[PDB]
């Protein structure tokens with residue numbers, strides 16, 4: 007359990023010490039938000055969280071930022087696309103707020119992004135603060151990727167906010183009743199959800215997003231309400247997730263020449279981690295003294311997901327993130343052997 011401590015402490019100090027990167031991001035974002043609010047289609051745009059500009063998915067990249075701009079859409083009509091459980095058409099039920107994007111009753115996403123990019127394109131050129139350059143690599147969202155200075159990069163995703171109850175494909179998901187209680191699940195399922203532009207594999211579809219729910223679970227994660235509040239008796243749930251995230255980043259980086267790990271992301275490791283939290287609901291099953299063993303249960307469960315080619319979306323049980331149509335067995339067999347090598351040789355990619 008010793009070397010995992012040193013890894014988590016190197017990540018702690020780089021995450022902690024001073025950097026002007028977050029300040030430059032907030033300046034650019036606020037300039038965009040006031041510019042977008044001056045427009046008819048994006049007058050109600052805004053951050054998901056105020057103060058949360060420096061959201062870091064890549065846990066080893068201090069200069070990579072991930073922000074989400076939300077947009078409230080009253081009376082959303084969701085039409086599931088091709089039984090995909092996660093991809094939806096967006097239609098409308100008496101105003102014309104976003105009506106300048108309708109094609110029929112169906113809301114166009116690629117057109118809303120084009121107007122989203124041009125307005126951001128206008129505010130970027132009108133910047134005298136810092137060197138900011140825009141990139142338009144495909145994939146519906148992240149819609150825009152900005153670059154500030156020679157290190158700071160920001161991915162900006164436009165998201166629609168719905169406040170109706172979650173789509174039916176989520177009814178049997180979020181199985182936290184024996185871990186976080188059934189009453190917390192009812193509270194969380196009363197919160198809004200978000201839709202980002204995404205293709206399953208052309209059409210104008212959107213994907214469900216519950217990252218805000220995941221963030222709230224991570225900050226209130228124990229079966230006991232006082233979990234990790236006695237800072238001398240902290241569980242190792244968050245440390246296991248960091249170690250799982252850092253393992254995949256180091257493997258994706260070590261094999262970026264080959265293409266076998268491009269389909270994998272921290273969301274897969276994050277999803278598998280939540281499933282283990284359901285399997286092991288007791289805080290005693292996450293004792294800080296059992297860091298090595300608890301981290302091994304995560305590596306073990308994730309390895310079984312690769313072999314069986316089964317990883318359920320934590321909110322949508324019927325969506326298999328490891329479907330052979332999403333990731334072929336060659337890629338999953340490749341990742342299975344690389345982790346097994348790291349596990350047996352005491353994770354060399356950690357020092």
Ligand SMILES: O=C(O)c1cc(-c2ccccc2O)nc2c(Cl)cccc12
Pocket residue numbers: 092213214215216217271273319322325
């Ligand atoms: O925002 C989220 O909650 C979120 C959802 C999904 C997802 C949802 C349904 C089906 C497949 C998916 O991959 N994937 C993500 C990835 Cl890959 C990266 C970051 C966030 C997400």
Ligand SMILES: [Zn+2]
Pocket residue numbers: 227228233234240241242243
């Ligand atoms: Zn805890």
